Design an enzyme around this catalytic site. Sequence first.
Site, PDB file in Angstrom:
ATOM      1  N   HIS A  36      47.049  36.984  40.443  1.00  0.00           N
ATOM      2  CA  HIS A  36      45.874  37.834  40.276  1.00  0.00           C
ATOM      3  C   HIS A  36      44.555  37.098  40.417  1.00  0.00           C
ATOM      4  O   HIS A  36      43.545  37.737  40.723  1.00  0.00           O
ATOM      5  CB  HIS A  36      45.944  38.646  38.969  1.00  0.00           C
ATOM      6  CG  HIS A  36      46.278  37.841  37.749  1.00  0.00           C
ATOM      7  ND1 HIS A  36      45.330  37.190  36.990  1.00  0.00           N
ATOM      8  CD2 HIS A  36      47.471  37.594  37.154  1.00  0.00           C
ATOM      9  CE1 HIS A  36      45.921  36.579  35.977  1.00  0.00           C
ATOM     10  NE2 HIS A  36      47.221  36.806  36.056  1.00  0.00           N
TER      11      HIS A  36
ATOM     12  N   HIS B 109      38.744  30.669  35.748  1.00  0.00           N
ATOM     13  CA  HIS B 109      39.241  31.384  36.906  1.00  0.00           C
ATOM     14  C   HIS B 109      38.090  32.219  37.431  1.00  0.00           C
ATOM     15  O   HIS B 109      37.017  32.280  36.819  1.00  0.00           O
ATOM     16  CB  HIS B 109      40.428  32.290  36.553  1.00  0.00           C
ATOM     17  CG  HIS B 109      40.084  33.335  35.544  1.00  0.00           C
ATOM     18  ND1 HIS B 109      40.115  33.103  34.183  1.00  0.00           N
ATOM     19  CD2 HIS B 109      39.592  34.588  35.701  1.00  0.00           C
ATOM     20  CE1 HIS B 109      39.697  34.188  33.548  1.00  0.00           C
ATOM     21  NE2 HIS B 109      39.360  35.100  34.448  1.00  0.00           N
TER      22      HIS B 109
ATOM     23  N   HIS C  79      36.861  36.005  39.668  1.00  0.00           N
ATOM     24  CA  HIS C  79      37.095  37.323  40.246  1.00  0.00           C
ATOM     25  C   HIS C  79      36.131  37.450  41.420  1.00  0.00           C
ATOM     26  O   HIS C  79      34.981  37.000  41.326  1.00  0.00           O
ATOM     27  CB  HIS C  79      36.769  38.415  39.213  1.00  0.00           C
ATOM     28  CG  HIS C  79      37.543  38.290  37.934  1.00  0.00           C
ATOM     29  ND1 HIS C  79      38.760  38.908  37.725  1.00  0.00           N
ATOM     30  CD2 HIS C  79      37.329  37.502  36.851  1.00  0.00           C
ATOM     31  CE1 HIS C  79      39.217  38.573  36.526  1.00  0.00           C
ATOM     32  NE2 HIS C  79      38.367  37.719  35.976  1.00  0.00           N
TER      33      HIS C  79
ATOM     34  N   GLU D 155      32.741  41.372  37.780  1.00  0.00           N
ATOM     35  CA  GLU D 155      33.256  42.330  36.813  1.00  0.00           C
ATOM     36  C   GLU D 155      32.108  42.939  36.015  1.00  0.00           C
ATOM     37  O   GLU D 155      31.908  44.160  36.030  1.00  0.00           O
ATOM     38  CB  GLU D 155      34.294  41.636  35.924  1.00  0.00           C
ATOM     39  CG  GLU D 155      35.498  41.269  36.775  1.00  0.00           C
ATOM     40  CD  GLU D 155      36.746  41.027  35.989  1.00  0.00           C
ATOM     41  OE1 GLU D 155      36.766  40.344  34.944  1.00  0.00           O
ATOM     42  OE2 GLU D 155      37.712  41.696  36.380  1.00  0.00           O
TER      43      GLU D 155
ATOM     44  N   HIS E 250      34.850  32.888  34.972  1.00  0.00           N
ATOM     45  CA  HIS E 250      35.153  33.027  33.551  1.00  0.00           C
ATOM     46  C   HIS E 250      35.704  31.711  33.036  1.00  0.00           C
ATOM     47  O   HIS E 250      36.774  31.272  33.468  1.00  0.00           O
ATOM     48  CB  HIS E 250      36.180  34.135  33.338  1.00  0.00           C
ATOM     49  CG  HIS E 250      35.621  35.493  33.592  1.00  0.00           C
ATOM     50  ND1 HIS E 250      36.399  36.604  33.847  1.00  0.00           N
ATOM     51  CD2 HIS E 250      34.333  35.905  33.641  1.00  0.00           C
ATOM     52  CE1 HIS E 250      35.608  37.650  34.020  1.00  0.00           C
ATOM     53  NE2 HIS E 250      34.352  37.253  33.905  1.00  0.00           N
TER      54      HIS E 250
ATOM     55  N   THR F  76      39.726  41.160  30.563  1.00  0.00           N
ATOM     56  CA  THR F  76      39.540  42.120  31.642  1.00  0.00           C
ATOM     57  C   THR F  76      40.787  42.298  32.485  1.00  0.00           C
ATOM     58  O   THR F  76      40.741  43.042  33.466  1.00  0.00           O
ATOM     59  CB  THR F  76      38.397  41.727  32.567  1.00  0.00           C
ATOM     60  OG1 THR F  76      38.764  40.539  33.281  1.00  0.00           O
ATOM     61  CG2 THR F  76      37.102  41.509  31.803  1.00  0.00           C
ATOM     62  N   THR F  77      41.880  41.608  32.152  1.00  0.00           N
ATOM     63  CA  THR F  77      43.190  41.834  32.737  1.00  0.00           C
ATOM     64  C   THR F  77      44.178  42.146  31.628  1.00  0.00           C
ATOM     65  O   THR F  77      43.961  41.758  30.465  1.00  0.00           O
ATOM     66  CB  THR F  77      43.688  40.618  33.538  1.00  0.00           C
ATOM     67  OG1 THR F  77      43.653  39.425  32.730  1.00  0.00           O
ATOM     68  CG2 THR F  77      42.853  40.420  34.781  1.00  0.00           C
TER      69      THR F  77
HETATM   70  N1  LIG Z   1      39.463  37.850  32.820  1.00  0.00           N
HETATM   71  S1  LIG Z   1      39.220  37.308  31.272  1.00  0.00           S
HETATM   72  O1  LIG Z   1      38.677  38.481  30.386  1.00  0.00           O
HETATM   73  O2  LIG Z   1      38.345  35.995  31.171  1.00  0.00           O
HETATM   74  C1  LIG Z   1      40.827  36.776  30.604  1.00  0.00           C
HETATM   75  C2  LIG Z   1      40.888  35.623  29.898  1.00  0.00           C
HETATM   76  C3  LIG Z   1      42.093  35.247  29.381  1.00  0.00           C
HETATM   77  C4  LIG Z   1      43.170  36.025  29.608  1.00  0.00           C
HETATM   78  N2  LIG Z   1      44.443  35.743  29.037  1.00  0.00           N
HETATM   79  C5  LIG Z   1      44.777  34.624  28.253  1.00  0.00           C
HETATM   80  O3  LIG Z   1      44.091  33.765  28.038  1.00  0.00           O
HETATM   81  N3  LIG Z   1      46.089  34.634  27.736  1.00  0.00           N
HETATM   82  C6  LIG Z   1      46.595  33.530  26.966  1.00  0.00           C
HETATM   83  C7  LIG Z   1      48.057  33.858  26.808  1.00  0.00           C
HETATM   84  C8  LIG Z   1      48.203  35.069  25.899  1.00  0.00           C
HETATM   85  C9  LIG Z   1      49.299  34.823  24.877  1.00  0.00           C
HETATM   86  O4  LIG Z   1      50.051  35.960  24.576  1.00  0.00           O
HETATM   87  C10 LIG Z   1      43.092  37.187  30.297  1.00  0.00           C
HETATM   88  C11 LIG Z   1      41.897  37.559  30.809  1.00  0.00           C
HETATM   89 ZN   LIG Z   2      38.402  36.830  34.135  1.00  0.00          ZN
END
Ligand SMILES: NS(=O)(=O)c1ccc(NC(=O)NCCCCO)cc1
Ligand SMILES: [Zn+2]
Length: 257
Positions: free
Chosen positions: A61, A91, A93, A103, A116, A195-196
């Site tokens: 993604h 990462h 987007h 976003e 992000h 946001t995912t």
């Molecule tokens: N796009 S965003 O809002 O910056 C984002 C950041 C972290 C994550 N996920 C994350 O850090 N997961 C750590 C593992 C979860 C443990 O169940 C998903 C989206």
């Molecule tokens: Zn993100």
Amino acid sequence: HWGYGKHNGPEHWHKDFPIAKGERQSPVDIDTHTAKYDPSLKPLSVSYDQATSLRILNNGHSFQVTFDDSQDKAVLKGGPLDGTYRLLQFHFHWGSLDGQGSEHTVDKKKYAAELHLVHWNTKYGDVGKAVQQPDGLAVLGIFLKVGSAKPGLQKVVDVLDSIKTEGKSADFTNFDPRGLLPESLDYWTYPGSLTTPPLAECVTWIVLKEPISVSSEQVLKFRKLNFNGEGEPEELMVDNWRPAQPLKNRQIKASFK
Ligand SMILES: NS(=O)(=O)c1ccc(NC(=O)NCCCCO)cc1
Ligand SMILES: [Zn+2]
Ligand SMILES: NS(=O)(=O)c1ccc(NC(=O)NCCCCO)cc1
């Protein structure tokens, strides 16, 4: 599984992740005339001098750069935050065209991409616990516009050929994320979500006012990545952004006038 296509994109996510329709979802439109200057907000403290990057990964993604978060090596503090938040990964987007990809939006304006930098509150011990807490994560969001190149992004751009498809990873040590920051640390902040999927409502969002500029060649390299794994029909990794969600009962605060 979830993604960004017609049949698995953001409008479908609520069926497996019902918090998609929750009270503090991200991203949002930042209406700059409605955000309120909060003089109590402290300057951000970005302490990345000891950062230890580890790997760069295509996760199907986005692509992400992971850091050693087993000690306070790269931490975010201050701003609206109580306590210390450790950098785990960054990462991006991005869009298929320069007029979309971010976003968050600013007065409905979309940027070409959004960075992000994901941090977790050390009082919860590990990121998995932190995602279960309303103050578990702090994500520093930085807009990208297309213009001059960003020198500090080039090492990322040059390795993307090695992680073209989902699941591929490469060594990515000694990367300095300070090379991705703009000059000013003025920010907006609001309580939000990942946001995912799983869209957990665990994020203090800190969105920088000043975008960074990247070159057309740099963003084109983002757009050569693939959502698919090796040996599957090729689907370019573009437009991996969630649109703005309802602000609901939230106020966006600004660190600046
Ligand atoms: N796009 S965003 O809002 O910056 C984002 C950041 C972290 C994550 N996920 C994350 O850090 N997961 C750590 C593992 C979860 C443990 O169940 C998903 C989206
Ligand atoms: Zn993100
Ligand atoms: N998580 S989500 O956005 O609510 C979602 C989950 C599964 C699906 N499943 C799906 O589209 N399946 C058909 C593809 C299977 C053949 O490879 C679509 C959206």
